[PDB]
Amino acid sequence: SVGNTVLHALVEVADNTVDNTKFVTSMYNEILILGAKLHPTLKLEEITNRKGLTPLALAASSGKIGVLAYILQREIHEPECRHLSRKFTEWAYGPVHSSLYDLSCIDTCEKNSVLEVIAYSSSETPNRHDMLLVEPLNRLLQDKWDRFVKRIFYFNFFVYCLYMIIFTAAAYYRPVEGLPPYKLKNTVGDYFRVTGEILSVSGGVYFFFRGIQYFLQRRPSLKSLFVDSYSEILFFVQSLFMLVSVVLYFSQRKEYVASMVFSLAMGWTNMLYYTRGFQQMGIYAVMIEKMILRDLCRFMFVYLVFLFGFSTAVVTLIEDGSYNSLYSTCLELFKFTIGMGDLEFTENYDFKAVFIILLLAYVILTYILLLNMLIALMGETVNKIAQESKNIWKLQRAITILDTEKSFLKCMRKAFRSGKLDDYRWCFRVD
Amino acid sequence: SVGNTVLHALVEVADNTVDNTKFVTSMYNEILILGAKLHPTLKLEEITNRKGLTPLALAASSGKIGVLAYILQREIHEPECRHLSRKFTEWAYGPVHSSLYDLSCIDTCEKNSVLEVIAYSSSETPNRHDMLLVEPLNRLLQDKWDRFVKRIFYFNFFVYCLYMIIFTAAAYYRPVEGLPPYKLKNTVGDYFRVTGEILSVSGGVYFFFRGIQYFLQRRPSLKSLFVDSYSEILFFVQSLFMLVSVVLYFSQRKEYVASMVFSLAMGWTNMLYYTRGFQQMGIYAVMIEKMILRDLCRFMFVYLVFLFGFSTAVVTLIEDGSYNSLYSTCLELFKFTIGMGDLEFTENYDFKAVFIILLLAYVILTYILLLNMLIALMGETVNKIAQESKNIWKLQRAITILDTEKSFLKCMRKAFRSGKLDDYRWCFRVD
Amino acid sequence: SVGNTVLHALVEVADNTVDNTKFVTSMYNEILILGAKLHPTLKLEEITNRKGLTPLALAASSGKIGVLAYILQREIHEPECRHLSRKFTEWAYGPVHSSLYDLSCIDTCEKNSVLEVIAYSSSETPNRHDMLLVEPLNRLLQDKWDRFVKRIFYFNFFVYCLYMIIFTAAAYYRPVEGLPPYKLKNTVGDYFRVTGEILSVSGGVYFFFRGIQYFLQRRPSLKSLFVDSYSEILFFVQSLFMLVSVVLYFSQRKEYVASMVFSLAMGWTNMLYYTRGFQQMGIYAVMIEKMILRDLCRFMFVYLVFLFGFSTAVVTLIEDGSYNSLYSTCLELFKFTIGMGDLEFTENYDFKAVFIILLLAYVILTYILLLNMLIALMGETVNKIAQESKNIWKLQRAITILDTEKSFLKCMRKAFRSGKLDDYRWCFRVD
Amino acid sequence: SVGNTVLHALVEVADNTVDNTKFVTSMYNEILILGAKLHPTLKLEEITNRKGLTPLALAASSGKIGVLAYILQREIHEPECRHLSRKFTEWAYGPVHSSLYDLSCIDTCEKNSVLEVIAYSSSETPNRHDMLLVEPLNRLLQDKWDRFVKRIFYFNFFVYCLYMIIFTAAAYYRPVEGLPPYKLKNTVGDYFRVTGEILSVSGGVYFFFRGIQYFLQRRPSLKSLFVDSYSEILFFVQSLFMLVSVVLYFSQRKEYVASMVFSLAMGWTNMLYYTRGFQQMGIYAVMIEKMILRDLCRFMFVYLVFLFGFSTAVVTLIEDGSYNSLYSTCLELFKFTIGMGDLEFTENYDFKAVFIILLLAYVILTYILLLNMLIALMGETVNKIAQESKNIWKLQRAITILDTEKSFLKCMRKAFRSGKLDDYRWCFRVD
Ligand SMILES: C=C(C)[C@]12C[C@@H](C)[C@@]34O[C@](Cc5ccccc5)(O[C@@H]1[C@@H]3C=C(COC(=O)Cc1ccc(O)c(OC)c1)C[C@]1(O)C(=O)C(C)=C[C@@H]41)O2
Ligand SMILES: C=C(C)[C@]12C[C@@H](C)[C@@]34O[C@](Cc5ccccc5)(O[C@@H]1[C@@H]3C=C(COC(=O)Cc1ccc(O)c(OC)c1)C[C@]1(O)C(=O)C(C)=C[C@@H]41)O2
Ligand SMILES: C=C(C)[C@]12C[C@@H](C)[C@@]34O[C@](Cc5ccccc5)(O[C@@H]1[C@@H]3C=C(COC(=O)Cc1ccc(O)c(OC)c1)C[C@]1(O)C(=O)C(C)=C[C@@H]41)O2
Ligand SMILES: C=C(C)[C@]12C[C@@H](C)[C@@]34O[C@](Cc5ccccc5)(O[C@@H]1[C@@H]3C=C(COC(=O)Cc1ccc(O)c(OC)c1)C[C@]1(O)C(=O)C(C)=C[C@@H]41)O2
Ligand code: NA
Numbered sequence A, B, C, D: 001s002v003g004n005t006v007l008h009a010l011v012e013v014a015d016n017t018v019d020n021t022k023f024v025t026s027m028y029n030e031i032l033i034l035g036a037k038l039h040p041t042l043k044l045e046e047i048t049n050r051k052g053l054t055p056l057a058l059a060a061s062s063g064k065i066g067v068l069a070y071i072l073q074r075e076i077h078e079p080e081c082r083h084l085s086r087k088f089t090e091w092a093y094g095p096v097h098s099s100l101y102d103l104s105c106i107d108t109c110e111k112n113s114v115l116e117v118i119a120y121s122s123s124e125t126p127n128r129h130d131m132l133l134v135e136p137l138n139r140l141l142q143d144k145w146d147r148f149v150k151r152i153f154y155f156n157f158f159v160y161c162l163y164m165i166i167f168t169a170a171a172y173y174r175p176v177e178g179l180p181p182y183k184l185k186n187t188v189g190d191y192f193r194v195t196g197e198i199l200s201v202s203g204g205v206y207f208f209f210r211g212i213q214y215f216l217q218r219r220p221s222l223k224s225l226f227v228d229s230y231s232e233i234l235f236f237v238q239s240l241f242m243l244v245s246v247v248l249y250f251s252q253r254k255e256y257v258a259s260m261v262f263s264l265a266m267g268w269t270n271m272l273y274y275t276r277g278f279q280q281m282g283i284y285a286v287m288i289e290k291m292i293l294r295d296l297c298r299f300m301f302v303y304l305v306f307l308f309g310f311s312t313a314v315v316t317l318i319e320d321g322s323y324n325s326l327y328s329t330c331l332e333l334f335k336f337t338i339g340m341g342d343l344e345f346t347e348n349y350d351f352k353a354v355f356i357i358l359l360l361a362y363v364i365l366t367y368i369l370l371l372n373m374l375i376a377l378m379g380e381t382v383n384k385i386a387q388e389s390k391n392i393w394k395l396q397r398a399i400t401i402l403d404t405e406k407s408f409l410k411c412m413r414k415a416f417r418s419g420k421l422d423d424y425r426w427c428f429r430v431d
């Protein structure tokens, strides 16, 4: 009905349990063998459904770990069936076994490769996180990293550091005259300043168009828009602030500074994107992302409810006879959170006992709030957050490898390890 | 002796263990079959005890989850006994099993339904918390939520937000002249102000009478008054502050403001009641409630003992030669807890070493106390607090559904799924 | 060699493991039966060693919980041996079994009873903590609590509250003239003041002599002096401060205030002693004690090493050209711990970069210290600290019951449950 | 190929698992027996590879705890093979077994002893950490500690305390005249000052040469430089600061103070080195070392990225119309971390909303950072950090014993327990 065959149904049946995995594996193997015996001329696994996914691509995209692990490491040691295998063993010693894997459909299917569907999954799949631990995929990604992607990624991080340093210098040394745009001066420092500004705007345009390219190629669902693509959204919003700053700058508004500094701040925090992909340092940025997306909404809602309620109570209580505004009272109550609450910031009230009782209740409740946030987050420290962060680190490495391979910047796409070692299957030697 | 029958004794025997659950289940099944064979004209499970509870209602109210799960999903596949079943399976596929459950006695018994006794239990029962996860009850509550209760609850939350915004505006813009009540002025701003005040008092009266209705219909035991009914108590106390404010306002006392701001503060914090029912955000309000009721007493007693002891020591030590009162010293020592302790807030003493030693001991002991509070709370985070909070979220969802169904605001009570599909058992189709 | 018999050796063999406990139980039963058959006229278990301990008292004092549990609940249902049993079951129903336990040697041996050795042991024994959960002992202690000790303990806590309130009032309203003792005034307030002072000194003398009595009766080893007897030490030191205050007061030194306030502070914190014995509120009172005795020494040593090192570095760096003392610099660096560190508290230096680097290093290191303290304490929260706190709560209840029974304040010692129900064995009915 | 024999390769087989440990045990026993039967005159285990390691030294250095445990406790009870054993039982009681272990190759091999290779390994080995718990090694190290090393270590700690007190006094009382060196005055205070300075520089020279000696003896790889030899690196850097201070002092620079205070601060914090060796107190210093080396880098990178980004945004936003420098803004934003952030530290801007939004975002993000650091560190508290800290404590105790034995300060190296009890195997009695 959906253009698929029995193998896609087999992929759908599996639920990453031992018995169902073995059942699906047995059916998959027997069906492949019988299909080869019935139709030796047909490629059984190359039929794509209406979504353009092969059974291997469907297993990769659907989060079916057992099926993917079986298929990628499938090996056959009987006549009339060796042509259906993907793994081939070259040497068999005690501790080490050297074997050739098939890179076909893993690096490219011309629509949807295995690494692409794994990396660019919706993140709502059951356990895609561990799919990169499968031997051929793990070693392929590590080889791609150590070969050429590592240097390219470090170069991109260095270039981003230069871009941010130039942006910081250009923004720091912005002229303080009124009503932009500003006329240049013959002093060399001003030529360096405008060169830095031009480079900053160029980088902003680059990130803007890269963000548009990402959103058009990925087409986020608008429900998982922030769950995935978080770093891309932050880079795009930083570029949006940069371009709004350019518009305000040429529109003769000093409010361009209001945009620019936000972009500047975002730009520096966007260096955490490059931190992700490091085994030790990337975990921290991953945890920041997950806390902001997942655990910050409820805390900020409850905290702002308490802050607004008690600030409205306090500002109602105080009357002039300084701080008479709701904003000032909100700031004074927020100061308690940062350990700078005066607790006698005004005397412009009647019923001092009421004012002090309100502030003490706010303090006690706010510390209860912070304590409950801590407790709620520490309830998830039993192997959950650590495993999730290591998994996201692996996924970021995979995504970086895929993006760098997509760019290649050399008009040359060849990045295979062993080559076509007839069975031209793009072998991959693993020792 | 208490008007009950053997089935209620069977309910009492069970203790939510596998062996006793199976034993009680076997006895219940055999008793029902034999009773139907002996008295085919009698409804065996409809006999109520002195408390008006059927054996199903007793199992639900008593926290006997195994017996409840057996009864609600009871199915019979033999002649002469099909009329004793509640579950009826109509289709049996691999992944799909479509069945009709019996809603009789779950939505209403005319005195005590299953959902009512589960939701309004004393909370001291063994395992009521997971009773809402039993398939017919979970599906029924989710159906009621998604059907009509979700919109009504969101509307009530929106109306409460409007009420609180109006109250905040009316209280913020209160006149600052002396000796209320204040004469209405012809300016439109004062017409809006008095309209907002009238609406605020109307909402206060509404919450006051709803609190009275809740306490009269529930009749809390005065020992679990705060363990359950916490949100209702907070709403009622907020309304009490509002009405005391009205009395003081018309009694020509400025002290009405002292009441009003507390109500205002409480009103905003009472928005957390609407937060409960959200799977992610409601856990925070649940944790706040549990910490205030359970853990705050211990910490507040120990902290106040240390604060009062050291403040009495300090105020005794200092002598005039500002802060000479016990209240001022208590505030100055409290300031250490919020990171604003001066540690040299006065020089009006002899024995500077004694004063500084007292303050340092207070600081060290207070941080020891806060550390031990953290430790004691973190000792309870091993899958306990999180599970309790998820359970309370489910219970609040059920309570919201029951209250909304009780109101109905349409002079129409019927909210059944499948209707009378002869055996008119108010079927509920689950797929 | 040590005056003991076979039963004491059997007690020593046990190590609170299932197999060794069963072995010791079998040997104890068989040797008791054989001894009764060989010497029917002798009481086998009444022989005491050189320490005055019976085998039951040795098992209780040595922390051999399995042997104690077997002996206290020993029951015999065969002829020629019933006289060797302690438990006597009178009724055996399904949910309830009504039995008589032997209180002989549990309430008194005239030297060392079971409850006395359990409560007043060094606390270094293996599992004295769970010995109070043994059915006869748990029910006996709960019965003693609910019968008469509960009211006496609450009365003592109330009297201590009155004593501390009187002390706080007398010390707060101390005269501010120089050179005590102070001549009285005919105003009634001064008569109340001197009456309060006399009552405060009387309470101090009472606690002084009670502390002496405790230390003479227990004779602490001076190595477990603080691990046990912590509350008694705090009460004794509070009384010592009171008596030193009396001496300084009559010695014409204002330094009596230096003593008095410490006593006052200690007195208020000593209310936590009465908090212990409550299942919930007592936990903090337990945990604080442990943190002071166990976890505070190492943290304070490391923290003071860092504080003193960086304070010496800073005070060396700064030079006059206010804070030039080591004490002032130590206070200014301590202020960082309480969130009140200025970070520019002086400009009296050369090399501002060095000063700021030192302060930033101190801040980062101190927050690492606090973080590592938290981490180390949280590493022991996996059922260890909480269980110890519950156990110490039970032990404090037992100690309170024993002390109250020792006092009795009625010239009447009998507090047995069932009496001499021939075999007059001071029965205790458990249902 | 590497100068080894079969025993070394067999030792390399083990991976500290039960099955491979048993396999290696059986093969090692059979190889030794057959070699003795084939070559009775040869010492089978004395053959060293190109690294100078015996199979025992290889098992110890390679972190093969099971093989080491078997070899060190090897015992033989058959003829023609007793000469191959190391453990010899002298008495066999029920709870006590008194046996003689062979100290040969444990105290010295003349190149690489067992204790030396265990203590001075790279720390990257699988399970060297628990090798010190092997009965002969644990008892030997405890015997060396209690015999003579405990007093020597406490003497060294006392001498270091005197050195640091003298250094603190000499640096505190440094003259405040310009342009060192300072001329000695005839007043006795300056004689004490110059004596203290000479002693401080002498201690610095001592630690400098001891650091060089250590680095020459170990030759760290420069990649594991800080993970092991952290304490020696800190002592060496303290001495480097001392000697740079000496050079600047005689170079007529006041900047010597800039060096001296660092060597003062480090010196006091280097007392934590002596804290290691206490069971309870040393864990804190171990945790500080691990926190600094492992976790501080990533947290400080992310924190400094946020601080620098928002400081650049804020300093760009503010314009003169005080704090106009990036350094001042960085300090003002750092103040939020220590609870002293003003949140209105300047008004020299336009767009107050932008400034306040930036500061609030920085505050919220920084507290998210601290919360995530806490969470990440608490995720590793499930028996991981505590066990590693206890292990490193045991390692430091062993290192202290080895260094003290290396010094001996008595021109006498003999420290064996039982001596040559014929078979002169340097027996060690364990009971
Ligand atoms: C798009 C979103 C969701 C976002 C954009 C801005 C407004 C952001 O605040 C938030 C909301 C916020 C505001 C204030 C405090 C905390 C969170 O979170 C990010 C967003 C969140 C941060 C903090 O997190 C990071 O950017 C670090 C980071 C971690 C992992 C990544 O993969 C990453 O990719 C670039 C970046 C930085 C800001 O962009 C920033 O510099 C300022 C001034 C505000 C931060 O909104
Ligand atoms: C009736 C009780 C028990 C209660 C009423 C008042 C006085 C309360 O303080 C307490 C005690 C207290 C006082 C100061 C600090 C902490 C706790 O807790 C609640 C009560 C507790 C809070 C904080 O908790 C909440 O109301 C949020 C909430 C969570 C879950 C809910 O189901 C809920 O239902 C409305 C509300 C808000 C206050 O009502 C408030 O706004 C002020 C000024 C004080 C709080 O007393
Ligand atoms: C005898 C000891 C060991 C002790 C006596 C004094 C000096 C003490 O500080 C300590 C050390 C100290 C000093 C400063 C901060 C923390 C700890 O701990 C107790 C001692 C510890 C405390 C804090 O702990 C408690 O007394 C609460 C408590 C808990 C459990 C109990 O069984 C108990 O019995 C009375 C008391 C209170 C003080 O006595 C006090 O009021 C002042 C001014 C200092 C405290 O020394
Ligand atoms: C060589 C390193 C790695 C080191 C040397 C200096 C600069 C150090 O800061 C660090 C980095 C640093 C800076 C500021 C805050 C935290 C960490 O960590 C240590 C180093 C770390 C510390 C804190 O840790 C300790 O020395 C305690 C300690 C624990 C365990 C040990 O075995 C130990 O051996 C001596 C010392 C103290 C300093 O030496 C010090 O006194 C000052 C002023 C800075 C600390 O650099
Ligand atoms: Na904290």
Ligand code: NA
Pocket (backbone or CB within 6 Å): A378, B378, C378, D378
């Ligand atoms: Na924790």
Ligand code: NA
Pocket (backbone or CB within 6 Å): A338, A339, B338, B339, C338, C339, D338, D339
């Ligand atoms: Na603070």
